[PDB]
Amino acid sequence: GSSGSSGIHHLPPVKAPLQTKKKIMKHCFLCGKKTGLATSFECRCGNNFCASHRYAEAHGCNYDYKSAGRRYLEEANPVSGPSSG
Ligand SMILES: [Zn+2]
Ligand SMILES: [Zn+2]
């Protein structure tokens, strides 16, 4: 003769879908129209503007771009300049 018994247990698995998302959201600095996603440009100053205000003048740019880049030109007075022979 004889006898005996016992017990058992269990436990469910643990896990979580760790997702992550992050995208840049740019937008004209003048008016404030979305540009990042699409229609984005850079100005001599750096500020990001829209295709409509992408040009410096468009937003009365401040950056001094006189040395490197110009539009209006004038003829200098008549000089002899002996430099040349
Ligand atoms: Zn704009
Ligand atoms: Zn500018």
Tokens of residue 2, six digits: 């004889």
Separation of CA 42 and ligand 1 centre (Å): 12
Report the alpha-carbon distance of residue 63 to residue 56 in Å, rounded. 9
Separation of CA 65 and ligand 2 centre (Å): 10
Report the alpha-carbon distance of residue 39 to residue 53 in Å, rounded. 11
Ligand nearest to C-alpha 53: 1
Distance of CA 85 to CAs 20, 26, 51, 76, Å? 72, 57, 51, 20
Q: 69 lies in which domain range? A: 1-85
Ligand nearest to C-alpha 52: 1
Using only C-alpha atoms, what is the Rg of the chain? 35
Number of domains, the chain: 1
Query: Which CATH number belongs to the domain containing residue 43 in this structure?
Result: 4.10.1110.10
Q: Is 45 exposed, middle or buried (0-12, 13-18, 19+ CB in 10 A)?
A: middle
Backbone angles phi, psi at 78, to 5 degrees: -70, 110
Instruction: Give the method used.
Output: NMR
